[PDB]
Design a protein around this ligand. Structure first.
Ligand SMILES: CN[C@@H](C)Cc1ccc2c(c1)OCO2
Length: 237
């Protein structure tokens, strides 16, 4: 009921100002937030910030000085602006929409990759909860019961702990909301559980289509964060 697409340069030179556009299409909305989230090579996800239905903005302290997210209702678009880019800003950028009143769904765009002309070598200050996913890579044969864990460095509200599945050439899809609730499109063979600083995702019976990457997410404390991630594979060469 809502679709998003990112557009902008695929390569930028240092010091230049990276600019991206998020074209939103679908039903109108009476609330919510539009976030920008980027993914670096290695697939680590970084929450950049958002702009709400009412224009309120929030930036990850780590980008504070260089970022700005603006909206343009008339043409149903939201923007990303990032100054003083460096090789550390190279990553595929995604925009996403979420309605606080509907914890169960999230919309992500295709994600346009952006690079910075090789090289690159500033005033935030903040704290954040670290999410650790071990093991990093895993193989299981079809039929095995699989369990993935997410360890938080500090307690988080279990209702704000989410899981995501992602496959090559595609963006993250909401898999589990509020520790143990499956999202739309998820086979019931999946389940989640946990509390405090300990959570886990479980697959009762491993299917070939479950091979992909899984990331846990925390939005109990600002800035929201994502886990290192677990890449799951199927055995048999
Ligand atoms: C579950 N994914 C998160 C990142 C969606 C989101 C974005 C902004 C919001 C909100 C939730 O809570 C308050 O500000």
């Amino acid at each position: 009921e809502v679709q998003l697409q990112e557009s902008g340069p695929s390569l930028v030179k240092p010091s230049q100002t990276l600019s991206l556009t998020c074209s939103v299409t679908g039903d109108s909305v009476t609330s919510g937030y539009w976030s920008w989230i980027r993914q670096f090579p290695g697939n680590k996800l970084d929450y950049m910030g958002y702009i709400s239905y009412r224009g309120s903005t929030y930036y990850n302290p780590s980008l504070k000085s260089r970022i700005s997210i603006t909206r343009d209702t008339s043409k149903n678009q939201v923007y990303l602006q990032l100054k003083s880019v460096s090789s550390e800003d190279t990553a595929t950028y995604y925009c996403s929409y979420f309605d606080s009143d509907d914890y169960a769904m999230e919309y992500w765009g295709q994600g346009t990759s952006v690079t910075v002309s090789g090289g690159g070598g500033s005033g935030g200050g903040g704290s954040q909860i670290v999410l650790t996913q071990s093991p990093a890579i895993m193989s299981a044969s079809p039929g095995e019961k699989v369990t993935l864990t997410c360890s938080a460095s500090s307690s988080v509200s279990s209702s704000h702990l989410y899981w995501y599945q992602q496959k090559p050439g595609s963006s993250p899809k909401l898999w589990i909301y509020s520790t143990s609730n499956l999202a739309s499109g998820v086979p019931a063979r999946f389940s989640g559980s946990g509390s405090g600083t300990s959570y886990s995702l479980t697959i009762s019976s491993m299917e070939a289509e479950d091979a992909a990457s899984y990331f846990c997410h925390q939005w109990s404390s600002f800035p929201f964060t994502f886990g290192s991630g677990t890449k799951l594979e199927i055995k048999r060469a």
